[PDB]
UniProtKB/Swiss-Prot annotation, chains A, B:
An example Gene Ontology molecular-function term: copper ion binding
Phosphotyrosine carried by residues: Y66
E.C. number(s) listed in UniProt: 3.1.2.-, 3.5.1.-, 3.5.1.124
The name this protein goes by in its record: Parkinson disease protein 7
Protein function: Multifunctional protein with controversial molecular function which plays an important role in cell protection against oxidative stress and cell death acting as oxidative stress sensor and redox-sensitive chaperone and protease. It is involved in neuroprotective mechanisms like the stabilization of NFE2L2 and PINK1 proteins, male fertility as a positive regulator of androgen signaling pathway as well as cell growth and transformation through, for instance, the modulation of NF-kappa-B signaling pathway.
Effect seen on changing C105A: Abolishes enzymatic activity. Abolishes oxidation, association with mitochondria and protease activity. No effect on chaperone activity. Reduces binding to OTUD7B
Effect of E17Q: Strongly decreases enzymatic activity
Gene from which the chain derives: PARK7
Medical condition linked: Parkinson disease 7: A neurodegenerative disorder characterized by resting tremor, postural tremor, bradykinesia, muscular rigidity, anxiety and psychotic episodes. PARK7 has onset before 40 years, slow progression and initial good response to levodopa. Some patients may show traits reminiscent of amyotrophic lateral sclerosis-parkinsonism/dementia complex (Guam disease).
Cross-link (Glycyl lysine isopeptide (Lys-Gly) (interchain with G-Cter in SUMO)): K129
Entries under Pfam families matching the protein: DJ-1_PfpI
Length: 188, 188
């Protein structure tokens, strides 16, 4: 009866945008797997923080399904996500079974690369807007967190807490989110 | 002409409170060393995020001095910090040369264990107040970030961005802090 979250971690990911959702989701009792795109080896994030994944993406793919698939940002991380055929397969399957897809900052741009969620309202980092909107396949929002159907997006490192709590609210409900939020000492 | 920051990482540290300052400080051009209390080996943080330090604390001690020494929180992390004689020596030396000491959430309680900064106004997580105030050696503040002389403290994971930007403002000034803050997409 435990919800499961997959966080996909590639070289160049924004480490804050990775650790904050992972931590918050585990405070909410979600089973999170931090899966390394390239294997089980340690991953050098964008600001040189180095994180050891729980599993390779190949292994974690076999222990699905997941209630949420999480795509962190960071410009080089999103590009690695956008180029990976394993990500495409994971996202297409998640879309088909109507599971949640969550992406933050530059992360949403992998959705475009993989033709995921066309027609949805999404947000990105302001610096990633032109890229996400190439072709007019989505509608752009400047809300800090945006959710349209099964696509949940958010804007940058400083929205990471709101993004994570929104995932918690979607999976476990508003009261768990409120209970997890209080000890964090957030402003709003 | 590069400012240097030491972040001391022990088993059980709050990973958000570790990654956010490290990342923000590196965006500001500070040379940060993430030093593992127990050695160069990977460290299991409080929510099971596993981080590889840059150096052991023994090695990093030799490449000082540092403009700021940073103590993350997490209850078991702070207790490991509070029990370590190497931390005591690092903090006492930092106090004597009037360098900045920054601690967040439960982190400040290591200051008490090591008799650092008595008489200063400090803040902690609300849950760590009774422990920090044992003996009346400090004055308690409920400000989200508190700075009194060379002691900079802050309250919890959700204050981590404000805490980090305050370190940046102290080391590099208000304009660098403002410049680093803007791309993060913080609310206030």
């Amino acid at each position: 009866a435990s919800k499961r979250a997959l966080v996909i971690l590639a070289k160049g990911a924004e480490e804050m945008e990775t650790v904050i959702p992972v931590d918050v989701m585990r405070r909410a009792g979600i089973k999170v797997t931090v899966a390394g795109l390239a294997g089980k080896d340690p991953v050098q994030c964008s600001r040189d923080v180095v994180i050891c994944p729980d599993a390779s993406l190949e292994d974690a793919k076999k222990e699905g399904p997941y209630d949420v698939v999480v795509l962190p940002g960071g410009n080089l991380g999103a590009q690695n996500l956008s180029e990976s055929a394993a990500v495409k397969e994971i996202l297409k399957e998640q879309e088909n079974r109507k599971g949640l897809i969550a992406a933050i900052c530059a992360g949403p741009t992998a959705l475009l690369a993989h033709e995921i969620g066309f027609g949805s309202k999404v947000t990105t980092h302001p610096l990633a807007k032109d890229k996400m909107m190439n072709g007019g396949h989505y509608t752009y929002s400047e809300n800090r967190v945006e959710k349209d159907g099964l696509i949940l997006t958010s804007r940058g490192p400083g929205t990471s807490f709101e993004f994570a709590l929104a995932i918690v609210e979607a999976l476990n409900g508003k009261e768990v989110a409120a209970q997890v939020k209080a000890p964090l000492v957030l402003k709003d």
